[PDB]
Amino acid sequence: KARIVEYEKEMEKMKNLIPFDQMTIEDLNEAFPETKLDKKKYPYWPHQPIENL
Amino acid sequence: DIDTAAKFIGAGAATVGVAGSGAGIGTVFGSLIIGYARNPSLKQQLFSYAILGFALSEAMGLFCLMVAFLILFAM
């Protein structure tokens, strides 16, 4: 039940989201830690494999 | 002076020799087009040879220009 209330809080955070047309790439990276660029494996522009670019 | 005059003439003449490099790159890139149109899976590799081919054609062209300047300035 602790885990459940935690999931609940998380989904609630995801519910209150900034309309996307006002969101900065930082706010996006916050709302989805996946979209954040790996500044370690690719510390140089564009910090990601050109293939998936 | 007649010397300066002949320098100009010989410069133009030695410059003529760049037509060979012109036609050479023409042929090389034409062949690259054909070879890629035939076996496109090898594109990358083919391109390599092309550059090398080009790199030698311009080579000879350079020599011409060389004498050109080596007559226009050094002599």
Binding site: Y7, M14, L17, F20, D21, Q22, F32 | -
Partner: protein, 105 residues
């Protein structure tokens, strides 16, 4: 912060409507046009605007730019808009996409 939905109402791509409305009270509507034709007649008359090869190259490049705009303006405009809406729709797919996930959990 959002973006305004429109620009500044430039006329002919060279002059904005601000100047036009600003001249509007005194000399009406053709005031600006008469100012332009005056100033150009002056520049080409008093040798301020010399006429040379540069003038014909200018005519050529301006003609090319204007024809290029009038031809491929809508295409690039709508292509930009398509890119934007595509990005937006994908982002919306992501919004409420993680929601259903945690919902199941």
């Amino acid at each position: 912060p959002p973006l305004p939905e429109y620009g500044g109402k430039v006329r002919y791509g060279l002059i904005p409507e601000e100047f036009f409305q600003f001249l509007y009270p005194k000399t009406g509507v053709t005031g600006p046009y008469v100012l332009g034709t005056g100033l150009i007649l002056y520049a080409l008359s008093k040798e301020i605007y010399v006429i040379s090869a540069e003038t014909f190259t200018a005519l050529s490049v301006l003609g090319v730019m204007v024809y290029g705009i009038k031809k491929y303006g809508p295409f690039v405009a709508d292509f930009a808009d398509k890119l934007n809406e595509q990005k937006l729709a994908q982002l919306e797919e992501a919004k409420q996409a993680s929601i259903q996930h945690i919902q199941n959990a």
